[PDB]
Amino acid sequence: SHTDIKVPNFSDYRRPPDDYSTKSSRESDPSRKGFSYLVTAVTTLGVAY
């Protein structure tokens, strides 16, 4: 039975410090995507040069 199955813990293990239950993941991630895309935005930028 599938009811007998859980998702392992990525908590800490991998999740960035803004991700630990009882706290909306959403308030913190437009900030998380902002970083990443910034890094990419910068590369496209540096590359153009």
Binding site: S1, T3, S11, S21
Partner: protein, 442 residues
């Protein structure tokens, strides 16, 4: 029409000195249905408590101390009344349907259950093995395991992630006690609602309830309703593979707003746009729902469904398709494309219908007594009061195109989705891909 709505009787509501809210809709129908709807689900369980509420459901009917099994069953059957019920993650309920000539009797029966289940140490042990079996049947229904897995990963690590039935270990070992412990902790008047619809007149109801629901609150806790721990959504996937199955199941979704929030209407209207398909339709010409049209032209799937399942302070806005081993990809491609289209370039011609199709549902949502009762039961419990069709109307009768976009995009665009898929899913591309299928190369 508008008049038909305007002439739809108001739904009487009133709380007791107890805390129970008693509401109903008087009609005329010689028949009716009454029942209590609890502010309890699996969400409220623990790692060791989980399953109680369900173990509990399977005993709720098997008799009370005031009147053992043989009797309760005999007394209901004998009056031609129907007793049925369920339990989700945040919402349980027990309802009876009789001839409104028995509000008082039904009402009493009800109470006697939500208050005195025999919990026969001898009966329990039986249902224990009944569930463990019933559970192994719920299993091969790949249409449900998939959703469970969805929730699992979607709300991984939180109360929501737990399935409503619970692990076999728990069921194999819950104690006569735990069940009682679950009952006496969540079945309290403040969280319960006694609703009805039929030939029943409010007063006779109130009194009847006010008479058999003789609960009394001492401290302030009893009188108050505890708010649950928020549940963290997580853009992630879970893949239960097995090419051994005839076809695959896929479900992808973003976090939902939650009952309280209004947009759940605009958002409810958008889903009406992509709608649903099912090989028994007759329509390569289906109005919009290109997903369906495309699904037909290119044979993308066996079926699919758009859904806005929501909870107290969160939810799931996504979709689910059943497809052959080989058309999984295109299907996902095409669908995921519709969400974008949905929130990036929707049209009035679309939303117009969208609305209508909703309104028709919105109304057939109340076809009969049992179902109406379900609304009163729910509405109160989750919204705070009742929303009359007359209202739902306006709410969703003023959603224009720009409104759909603004919202859908507010909840879908460039969000990290939560997918789940059991069956022969080798062709389903990686997360990264379905991920970047969340932004349109506008």
């Amino acid at each position: 029409y508008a008049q038909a709505l305007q002439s739809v009787p108001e739904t009487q509501v009133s709380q007791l000195d107890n805390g129970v809210r008693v509401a109903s809709e008087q009609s005329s129908q010689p028949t009716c249905t009454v029942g209590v709807w609890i502010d309890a689900g699996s969400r409220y369980e623990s790692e060791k408590n989980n399953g109680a509420g369900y173990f509990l459901e399977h005993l709720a009917f098997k008799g009370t101390k005031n009147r053992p099994q043989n009797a309760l069953e005999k007394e209901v059957e004998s009056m031609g009344a129907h007793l049925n019920a369920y339990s989700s993650r945040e919402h349980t309920a027990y309802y009876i349907k009789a001839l409104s000539k028995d509000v008082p009797k039904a009402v009493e029966l009800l109470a006697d259950i939500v208050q005195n289940c025999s919990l026969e140490d001898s009966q329990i042990e039986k249902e224990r093995d009944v569930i463990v079996r019933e559970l192994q049947e719920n299993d091969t229904s790949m249409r449900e395991v998939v959703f469970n897995y969805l929730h699992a990963t979607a709300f991984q690590g939180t109360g929501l992630a737990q399935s409503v039935e619970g692990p076999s270990e728990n069921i194999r070992k819950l104690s006569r006690a735990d069940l009682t412990e679950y009952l006496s902790t969540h079945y309290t008047a403040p969280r319960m609602v006694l609703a009805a619809a039929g030939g029943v007149e409010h007063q006779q109801l109130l009194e009847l309830a006010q008479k058999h629901f003789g609960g009394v609150p001492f401290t302030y806790d009893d009188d108050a309703v505890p708010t649950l721990s928020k549940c963290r959504f997580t853009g992630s996937q879970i893949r239960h593979r097995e090419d051994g199955l005839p076809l695959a199941h896929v479900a992808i979704a973003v976090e939902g707003p939650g009952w309280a929030h209004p947009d759940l209407v605009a958002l409810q209207v958008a889903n009406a746009i992509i709608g649903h398909y099912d090989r028994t339709y007759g329509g390569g010409l289906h109005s919009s729902s290109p997903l369906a049209s495309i699904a037909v032209t290119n044979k993308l799937c066996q079926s699919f469904q758009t859904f806005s399942i929501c909870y107290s302070e969160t939810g799931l806005f996504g979709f689910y398709f059943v497809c052959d081993r080989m058309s999984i990809d295109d299907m996902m491609f095409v669908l995921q494309g519709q969400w974008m289209r949905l929130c990036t370039s929707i049209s009035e011609s679309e939303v117009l219908r969208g609305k209508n199709f909703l309104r028709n549902a919105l109304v057939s949502h109340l076809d009969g007594t049992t179902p109406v009762c379900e609304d009163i039961g729910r509405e109160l419990l989750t919204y705070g009061r009742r929303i009359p069709l007359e209202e739902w109307e306006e709410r969703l009768a003023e959603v224009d195109a720009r409104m759909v976009r603004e919202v859908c995009s507010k909840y879908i665009y460039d969000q990290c989705p939560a997918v789940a898929g059991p069956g022969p899913i080798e062709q389903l591309p990686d997360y990264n891909r379905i991920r970047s299928g969340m932004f349109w190369l506008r």
